[PDB]
Structure 1
Amino acid sequence: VGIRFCQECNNMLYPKEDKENRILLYACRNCDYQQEADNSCIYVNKITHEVDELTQIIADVSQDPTLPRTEDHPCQKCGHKEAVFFQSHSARAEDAMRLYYVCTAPHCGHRWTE
């Protein structure tokens, strides 16, 4: 799923097969560097792609004046009464109209959907 980088030329490690032991290697094509993989996976296509948006939203948005605040949704982490809700607005999950909250107390920035 990720990119492995060589350790000599720092180019990208492409997967190849180890016949004599039949084990998946990652080998660089500018060196003879090889690395016995730990994944045994080469490529993953997520078509439905259930995504967490609680991970894209950065807590800095609690500094937005144009964002609606709330009181009847206290942060579970710190118990701060206020929050700052908004929607996804992302071409993938733009279909639903789910609200995410970002605790507005400084130093907390705890995101949560309900």
Structure 2
Amino acid sequence: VGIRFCQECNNMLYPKEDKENRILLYACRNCDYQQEADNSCIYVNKITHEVDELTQIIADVSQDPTLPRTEDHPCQKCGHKEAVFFQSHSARAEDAMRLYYVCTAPHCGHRWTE
């Protein structure tokens, strides 16, 4: 799923097929450096696009003076009783009125939806 760079000329390693041992070989076009593939899959295309933005929001958003705050929902990892919540603010806005939270305690940065 990732990418492979050549170890000699630092370029993009293409996948190739050899008719001897039935194993995927990654080859270079400039040089002909070789090696075998460990996962033996090339292409993947996610159309659902249901990526949870809990992996994209940053912990320093709790320094924003223009975001609402809450005393109801406390943090689990530290027990702080003050959070700051917001919406998806991104694409995939068909049914996007969820409410992600971020703890505001210094050096906690814990994030969670509900």
Scaled to the shorter chain, the TM-score interval is over 0.9
Q: In 1, Cα distance between the equivalents of 2:45 and 2:25?
A: 21
TM-score (norm 1): 0.93
Give RMSD over aligned pairs: 1.3
2:42 aligned counterpart, secondary structure: strand
Task: Note if contact 1:59-1:102 (Cα within 8 Å) is conserved in structure 2.
Answer: yes
CA shift in 2, pair 1:93/1:20, >3 Å: farther
1:96 aligned counterpart, secondary structure: coil
Provide runs of 4+ in structure 1 moved above 2 Å: 92-95
Q: In 1, Cα distance between the equivalents of 2:37 and 2:82?
A: 47
Q: Which runs of 5+ in 1 are unaligned?
A: none
Q: In 1, Cα distance between the equivalents of 2:26 and 2:18?
A: 10
TM-score (norm 2): 0.93
Identity %: 100
1:17-62 Cα deviation digits (max 9, x unpaired): 1221111111121111112111111110000122021010000101
1:54 aligned counterpart, secondary structure: helix
Task: Note if contact 1:88-1:94 (Cα within 8 Å) is conserved in structure 2.
Answer: no
CA shift in 2, pair 1:87/1:11, >3 Å: same
